[PDB]
Amino acid sequence: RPYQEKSLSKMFGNGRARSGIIVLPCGAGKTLVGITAACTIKKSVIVLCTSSVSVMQWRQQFLXXXXXXXXXXXXXXXXXXXXXXXXXXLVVSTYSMVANXXXXXXXXXXXXXXXXXXXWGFIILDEVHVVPAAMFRRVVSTIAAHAKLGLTATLVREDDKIGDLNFLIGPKLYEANWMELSQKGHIANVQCAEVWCPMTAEFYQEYLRETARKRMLLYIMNPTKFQACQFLIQYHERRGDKIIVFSDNVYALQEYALKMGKPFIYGSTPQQERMNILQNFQYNDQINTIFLSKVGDTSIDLPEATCLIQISSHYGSRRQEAQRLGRILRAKRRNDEGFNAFFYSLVSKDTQEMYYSTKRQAFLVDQGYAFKVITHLHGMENIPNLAYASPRERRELLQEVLLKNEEA
Template sequence: DYAFESDPSLAKLDLVLRPEIEVRPYQTEALKAVVNQDSQDSSKHTVKSGIIVLPCGAGKSLTSILIAAAIKKPVLVVCSTIIAAEQFCNEFLRFTTLMASKTGMFAGAKKWPFNGPSGVLFTTYTMLVDNKNRASDSKRMANFVHSTDWGVIILDEVHQVPASGYSKAITKLKARVRLGLTATMLREDEKIEDLNTIVGPTLYHAKWKELADRGYIAKVICTQIETSMTDIVQKAYDAVQPSNGNQNNMLGHSHHLKSLLAILNPSKMQICQRLIQYHEARGDKILVFCDHIDAIKLYAEKLDRPLIYGGTSTEDARNLLQRFQIDAQKEQINTLFLSRIGDTSLDLPAATVIIQVSSHFGSRRQEAQRLGRILRAKKRSEKGFYSRFYTLVTTETHEITFSEKRRQFLEEDCGYGYQ
């Protein structure tokens, strides 16, 4: 445990929550699980390293800001994308009295330190990984990050840290406390256990269903729609044979081809189109997810809706996200197609409906993260309001097996019924 009040070696950070900010009871519980301020003697106040698990939309950022404001030492915030780092920076400025000059950025082309001996720096996991070919300004910023003694490092989407390279980069940083944030302690490769060593144990874990019942996050109706293939596509699917040439490669290729046919099943596209039309007419905001880049490009083109994927520039993505959030008739976007890039770190409180046309095998974490995109729906407090989560599945294909695994997770771990 770190006795932060009695450590004069780190410069104090003037970080105070704005008086009008409303803190929810479970956020206070999370704060108490991490920071011990029970003693009358402030020199005995301590903070420990570990992980906070809160559903998307339950205010993970604010919870971590509460902890940083209690410690009042230099903060490093590590995010998964540039947009997420910018969003986190905006939250610090919105929720606290922190001056903009006390924030620094080391993400993409934005590279500047904060002013003075203490502040908050925002970066991404990618920027922390050693890169021999860094430009001089990046080298200077990397040196700043590594030479600074951080009071607390906030690791957003901490489940990504066990990825090779990231964990090594994190352990090299000098920090009194490491605080991980995630919506789900799941990785399909079982490496989640590594977080115990790299960050610390889970200190607070809020149950999704409980928060929904208390009105903090939206209630969700999950629906799986199963559709069979058209005869032509079924014939093509059955005709795909693994070649005896390079077994591994070809098996991979045949699986790729079969999954593409299952996604591009015309009946599935038709159902997707009808759901979009139905929900747009009701004034909903819809996110359509597909992991397969070629397939999602085709869907977006055929259904004439905008798309954000890895090849979309940060500027275009930012513009589309802003237009998705607004209700003005002229500029607004009501449906947005997203590749796997939309699984994490996009702040989209306007979204009320998700349509999943394909997903990453049976990944439970991905299912939870996608569901999280509609948990903070702005209308969540309206009587009788439910967000909707649709999974479209082609029958008699591998999609059925994978969807069962994910469905079981949502029912058992998150408490959401499927229909």
């Protein structure tokens, strides 16, 4: 990819003594850039990752290059260990395993052999936006190499600590514009859209009488959000496109999941059921609407479903939802003549959550994506299958929300 050689030209310029951060999309090949840099340096390279799936991907890249089984390419994890050799090495480690404090499973010595014997020379950190934390400062404080590299896709955080990475690892060298990359490769056009649904009177006065995170249980459970949600679901099913529903709250995800009758993936869920739901979403055309929480978004991103719906949200964590949204957008690439990606933000008027979703839309403006407002698409008035459209169901839902407030 041209931008990858545009990033490698900086390494080809000076050669020795260099450190910086390279911003590349998730769908791009930053791991290939790490492989090329590993071929240019030829030394013990350590790749800092947070999940085993990324370790398996880096191992697959090592297989795409050459060798992995002979005593040279090592693997560090809490399950097994593998030997290494000087002058050339490729190993992937976990942040929580290298960090620690005093808990030990007779494996911290195996890491202190890679760090004690001084077999290093190249540092690779996956997702640098997570570095602003004490454990990563300890990791950097326990390592020292000749060349450092930071592979990440985003860096927008409101912790005011992203600027420290300019001296902890190095200043950002190349930031690729996702619009020009969309022109190089169709990574699904980004259509940002907020749905403005009216707010009922009872949920408005009860919403004002509530506060903190409890008023979210009155912002999400609005009947017009169920009507507009069903209208968007039936609309996308009529267009023949799969639907992914995001929710920062597990309770709302279970409510919409059970009321819509679709599979759901949330916390404390068996992994076999998660894999079954994933296979049903990949193969079965009857399941075109999945309800995914943060566990289903951080662990895996699927290239299907051009329809992304956002209902639940948390205060301040708008940039993280923009990063996950960006992961689902960049995950969809196949060079199509159309390829229209639709992001809907179900927001209710006069609520305290839309005013942060606007900050998320500001993050979506900083990336160059297109944003437009949507009050209501004509067609919901012709859907007799809408729930909570009658005053009876609205009063019953009001009583259910009041009971939910009495439980919390």
